[PDB]
Amino acid sequence: SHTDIKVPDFSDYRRPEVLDSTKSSKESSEAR
Amino acid sequence: LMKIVNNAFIDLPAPSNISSWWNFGSLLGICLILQILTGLFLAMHYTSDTTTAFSSVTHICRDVNYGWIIRYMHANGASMFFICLYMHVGRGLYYGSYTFLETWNIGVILLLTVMATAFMGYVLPWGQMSFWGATVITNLLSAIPYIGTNLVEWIWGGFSVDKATLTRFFAFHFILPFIIMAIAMVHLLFLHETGSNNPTGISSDVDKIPFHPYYTIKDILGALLLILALMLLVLFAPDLLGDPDNYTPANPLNTPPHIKPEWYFLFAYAILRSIPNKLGGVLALAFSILILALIPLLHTSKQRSMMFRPLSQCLFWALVADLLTLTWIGGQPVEHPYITIGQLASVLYFLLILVLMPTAGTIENKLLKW
Amino acid sequence: PTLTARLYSLLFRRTSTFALTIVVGALFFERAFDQGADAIYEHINEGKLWKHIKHKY
Amino acid sequence: DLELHPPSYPWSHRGLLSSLDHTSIRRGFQVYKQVCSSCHSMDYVAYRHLVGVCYTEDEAKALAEEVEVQDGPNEDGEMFMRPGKLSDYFPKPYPNPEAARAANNGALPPDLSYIVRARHGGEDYVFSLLTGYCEPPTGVSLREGLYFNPYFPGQAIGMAPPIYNEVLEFDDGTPATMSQVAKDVCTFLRWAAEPEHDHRKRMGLKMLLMMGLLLPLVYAMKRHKWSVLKSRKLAYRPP
Amino acid sequence: RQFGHLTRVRHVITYSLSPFEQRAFPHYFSKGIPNVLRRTRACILRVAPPFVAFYLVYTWGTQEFEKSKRKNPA
Amino acid sequence: LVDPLTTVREQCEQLEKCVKARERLELCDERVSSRSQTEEDCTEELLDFLHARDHCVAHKLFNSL
Amino acid sequence: WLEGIRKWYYNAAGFNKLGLMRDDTIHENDDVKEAIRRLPENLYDDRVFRIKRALDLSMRQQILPKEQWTKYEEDKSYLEPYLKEVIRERKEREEWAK
Ligand code: HEC
Numbered sequence: 049s050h051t052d053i054k055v056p057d058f059s060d061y062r063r064p065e066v067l068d069s070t071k072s073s074k075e076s077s078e079a080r
Numbered sequence: 081l082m083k084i085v086n087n088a089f090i091d092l093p094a095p096s097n098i099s100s101w102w103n104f105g106s107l108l109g110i111c112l113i114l115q116i117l118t119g120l121f122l123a124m125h126y127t128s129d130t131t132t133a134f135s136s137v138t139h140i141c142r143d144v145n146y147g148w149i150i151r152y153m154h155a156n157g158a159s160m161f162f163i164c165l166y167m168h169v170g171r172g173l174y175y176g177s178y179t180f181l182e183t184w185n186i187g188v189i190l191l192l193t194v195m196a197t198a199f200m201g202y203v204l205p206w207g208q209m210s211f212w213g214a215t216v217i218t219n220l221l222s223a224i225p226y227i228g229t230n231l232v233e234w235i236w237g238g239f240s241v242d243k244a245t246l247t248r249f250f251a252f253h254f255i256l257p258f259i260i261m262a263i264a265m266v267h268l269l270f271l272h273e274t275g276s277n278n279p280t281g282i283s284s285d286v287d288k289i290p291f292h293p294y295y296t297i298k299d300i301l302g303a304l305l306l307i308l309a310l311m312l313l314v315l316f317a318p319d320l321l322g323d324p325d326n327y328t329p330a331n332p333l334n335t336p337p338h339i340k341p342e343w344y345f346l347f348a349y350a351i352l353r354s355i356p357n358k359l360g361g362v363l364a365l366a367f368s369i370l371i372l373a374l375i376p377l378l379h380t381s382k383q384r385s386m387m388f389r390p391l392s393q394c395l396f397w398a399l400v401a402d403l404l405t406l407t408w409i410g411g412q413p414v415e416h417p418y419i420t421i422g423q424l425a426s427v428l429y430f431l432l433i434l435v436l437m438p439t440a441g442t443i444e445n446k447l448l449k450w
Numbered sequence: 451p452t453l454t455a456r457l458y459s460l461l462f463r464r465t466s467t468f469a470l471t472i473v474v475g476a477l478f479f480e481r482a483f484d485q486g487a488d489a490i491y492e493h494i495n496e497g498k499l500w501k502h503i504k505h506k507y
Numbered sequence: 508d509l510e511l512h513p514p515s516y517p518w519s520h521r522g523l524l525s526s527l528d529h530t531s532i533r534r535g536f537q538v539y540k541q542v543c544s545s546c547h548s549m550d551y552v553a554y555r556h557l558v559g560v561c562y563t564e565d566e567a568k569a570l571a572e573e574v575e576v577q578d579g580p581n582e583d584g585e586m587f588m589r590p591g592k593l594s595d596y597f598p599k600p601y602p603n604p605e606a607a608r609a610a611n612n613g614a615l616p617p618d619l620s621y622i623v624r625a626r627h628g629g630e631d632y633v634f635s636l637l638t639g640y641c642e643p644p645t646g647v648s649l650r651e652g653l654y655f656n657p658y659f660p661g662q663a664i665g666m667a668p669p670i671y672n673e674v675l676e677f678d679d680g681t682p683a684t685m686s687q688v689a690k691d692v693c694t695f696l697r698w699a700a701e702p703e704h705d706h707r708k709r710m711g712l713k714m715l716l717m718m719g720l721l722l723p724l725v726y727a728m729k730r731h732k733w734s735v736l737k738s739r740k741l742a743y744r745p746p
Numbered sequence: 747r748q749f750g751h752l753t754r755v756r757h758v759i760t761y762s763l764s765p766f767e768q769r770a771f772p773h774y775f776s777k778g779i780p781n782v783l784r785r786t787r788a789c790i791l792r793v794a795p796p797f798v799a800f801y802l803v804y805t806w807g808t809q810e811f812e813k814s815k816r817k818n819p820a
Numbered sequence: 821l822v823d824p825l826t827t828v829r830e831q832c833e834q835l836e837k838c839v840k841a842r843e844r845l846e847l848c849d850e851r852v853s854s855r856s857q858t859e860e861d862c863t864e865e866l867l868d869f870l871h872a873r874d875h876c877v878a879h880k881l882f883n884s885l
Numbered sequence: 886w887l888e889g890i891r892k893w894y895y896n897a898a899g900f901n902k903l904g905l906m907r908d909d910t911i912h913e914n915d916d917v918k919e920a921i922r923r924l925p926e927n928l929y930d931d932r933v934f935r936i937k938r939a940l941d942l943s944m945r946q947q948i949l950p951k952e953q954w955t956k957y958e959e960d961k962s963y964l965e966p967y968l969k970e971v972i973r974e975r976k977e978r979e980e981w982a983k
Pocket residue numbers: 542543545546547611614615616617622626633637659664665666667669670692
């Protein structure tokens with residue numbers, strides 16, 4: 049159902065600054 | 081509030097699977113404005129009289145502050161115009177857009193408007209090919225019976241080209257692009273009731289998207305390459321396409337050995353030149369163009385595109401060759417090696433359209449059982 | 451912060467500033483690009499231009 | 508019977524950023540005056556176009572003061588002659604074409620304003636025209652006045668040989684050989700049919716270093732927006 | 747015409763990302779150039795051969811034209 | 821006083837394509853001159869000599885000038 | 886021999902390289918819009934998704950891997966019953982008018 053849904057991983061496409069899911073945004077956002 | 085019409089140009093639904101081919105469909109909006117913009121400032125100094133015209137060109141090319149550019153942004157710009165067309169026209173064949181019957185027919189009348197405009201645009205400066213190029217093309221209408229001599233004299237203001245026949249064009253010529261500017265809006269209006277026509281041929285209504293961020297910049301990118309491939313000509317090779325003779329003043333008592341109008345007629349001029357008869361070759365010419373109106377009654381495949389018709393692909397690009405041949409074969413004089421090719425190639429043109437492109441879909445329907 | 455992020459929050463954030471930035475950069479850019487090409491054009495055509503034969507006459 | 512293609516000679520200006528050796532324009536102008544200007548009606552130029560290219564204001568103005576020009580309705584109701592000024596075009600040799608045909612063997616000198624761009628090959632033709640006068644071949648006979656030169660169509664021309672070694676002498680004193688003349692003149696004629704060559708290449712150059720610099724950035728700004736949809740996965744999750 | 751009454755969709759899901767959260771040109775060299783070839787192999791056969799033949803009729807058309815101007819032994 | 825050109829034409833008439841066409845020219849030359857009534861000429865062969873010549877004159881001549 | 890050619894043409898047209906079927910690519914007209922209106926939900930949405938991804942991949946000029954391609958034996962002719970039903974009514978509607 050709507051819980052079985054899942055988002056794929058665009059880590060083949062992202063910027064390097066954000067690949068680390070453990071980190072946060074907002075420290076490279078202003079640069080991005 | 082009338083801005084809401086630009087729902088057409090801002091919030092419009094259009095596909096997402098779109099090539100850079102359709103940029104060519106948009107550049108004419110730029111070329112048409114770019115040409116008029118140039119040509120207007122250009123025509124602040126032109127003169128519609130013989131004795132001063134050719135000087136009145138050189139009045140620009142020499143004395144005017146950066147007036148010399150505007151001749152060539154205009155002239156070669158008029159050629160980058162066509163280079164978009166004969167990719168834009170060949171498109172709908174290869175992607176099946178001619179099915180929009182209300183629109184394709186408009187795509188003719190724009191063309192004939194231009195191919196009678198650009199003609200007028202070559203003759204203004206009296207380049208010794210202007211005159212004879214005006215004579216050769218215009219004289220053909222004399223081939224008609226019982227009215228040919230009357231019309232051509234009527235448009236020659238007399239008995240041959242002279243001061244009057246110049247000025248009858250400079251006004252017929254400085255006006256029509258506006259008639260194109262208007263009819264172009266019609267050419268979009270019938271579209272807006274159906275929208276574009278994807279390469280596949282499928283109604284992509286499920287996957288239509290906006291237009292302000294996406295195809296805008298793409299069109300600019302398309303436009304940017306145009307200006308690039310227009311600045312190169314004017315800056316680095318303006319003498320390339322335009323025949324050199326057009327800098328010679330005009331004299332009816334001296335012809336050049338070789339005559340050809342500007343390069344872009346040549347797919348069509350050659351067709352006439354093939355036929356040794358006078359009249360019976362003419363009606364091939366006008367039919368060499370109006371045949372495009374005859375195509376939609378020859379759409380055989382219950383598919384639309386040619387992306388999914390590999391056989392017709394083999395015949396489509398084949399037609400491009402025959403054009404690229406007839407573009408060149410007319411550009412060369414009348415001698416036995418080439419005449420044997422025009423008798424073939426011109427027939428191939430009519431032949432590929434009216435026999436085999438239908439025949440493919442007649443087959444391809446049957447290879448797949450409908 | 452990188453230069454980029456320091457550049458963002460100063461200029462490229464407030465649109466009033468973002469237009470002020472561009473004319474500034476353009477106003478100076480006009481002063482460099484001309485000097486560049488005029489010298490490169492001078493350099494590649496060394497011994498050909500009028501200013502190179504401007505002292506004799 | 509045949510044409511003749513001149514070769515692809517080098518020049519000081521054949522490159523896509525190569526301008527004209529303005530020095531070479533200088534001596535070439537001397538040639539037009541001592542030699543050509545007795546029969547070549549160059550009308551679409553004036554001495555003022557020579558400023559900032561080959562001569563100065565005073566040196567060029569000296570040449571208009573040299574030759575007389577027909578100008579002015581006198582208050583008596585007549586016309587007279589005065590020394591030329593800068594604004595006057597080149598003194599035309601002959602008042603009309605016919606007298607030029609009568610002062611030759613019926614043939615007419617074409618103008619040299621735009622002859623280079625009006626003749627296939629331009630310089631290479633014109634250079635190899637003057638420097639292609641040769642004794643006729645076997646079996647060929649030619650009327651009086653005419654001469655032989657292969658490059659001209661028909662290989663039969665009413666062109667008296669205009670150049671010969673040390674037909675004149677230049678100012679700085681270079682070797683006035685038949686070739687060095689032919690360079691500086693052909694270098695001149697291109698300028699006649701192109702007073703914009705120097706500036707054509709400047710915007711000729713300024714273009715790329717904008718467009719070559721822009722065109723990627725746009726090509727990023729394109730890809731910056733489309734990247735939403737260059738990267739999109741779909742699905743189909745019915746019951 | 748506009749968005750809202752075009753046609754029907756049922757039970758379809760869309761996943762899309764900001765641009766800022768991703769590089770503009772990922773794998774431009776890596777995955778593209780093999781895709782250029784595969785794009786190319788699927789068109790080359792039914793695009794060239796006319797243009798190939800043109801190179802020959804631009805070839806023979808000039809050569810056979812050149813000869814005809816050269817004299818004959820007579 | 822000498823034209824720099826004639827020095828170069830002289831060096832080039834020794835070259836392969838130049839010499840060979842020169843030989844055909846003389847055979848055309850005798851073929852016609854030995855014949856009495858001919859609408860024929862060596863305008864044919866002369867050109868193949870010259871375009872072969874001027875190609876050498878091309879490559880270098882403005883080293884001197 | 887024939888049938889070795891239908892299977893080949895169907896591989897050269899391309900439209901097995903995009904997860905599509907044969908009925909998907911048909912020129913849309915009034916005769917066909919009738920049938921696509923007449924289809925059931927389970928098959929109709931199944932038409933949509935086949936198209937909706939082929940477009941996005943004709944955008945990129947990418948394709949599916951060789952495994953997910955379509956196979957000639959699986960080229961189901963799901964539309965033909967619903968279509969020929971129509972043109973029967975059309976010619977019944979015309980000849981009845983004459
Ligand atoms: C004797 C007067 C006279 C002299 C001096 C003269 N010209 Fe000529 N020029 C003519 C005439 C007469 C023709 C006619 C040629 C023809 O009818 O084909 C002509 C033709 C030409 C042409 C036309 C080429 C073509 O294809 O017909 C050029 C270019 C030219 N001259 C350049 C020059 C140059 C360069 C010089 C100086 C080296 C020069 N002229 C000196 C009278 C002259």
